[PDB]
Amino acid sequence: RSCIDTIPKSRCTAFQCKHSMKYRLSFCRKTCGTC
Ligand SMILES: [Cl-]
Ligand SMILES: [Cl-]
Ligand SMILES: [Cl-]
Ligand SMILES: [Cl-]
Secondary structure: OOOOOOOOHOOOOHHHHHHHHHHHHHHHHHOOOOO
């Protein structure tokens, strides 16, 4: 997958990164540090 967020990054919160796999893998790969 591409190393970009795919929703506005203000929604890529610490809470979502920590507690949601879909946010880590689909929506917020860059901001969550996934890639
Ligand atoms: Cl994939
Ligand atoms: Cl990548
Ligand atoms: Cl949140
Ligand atoms: Cl899920």
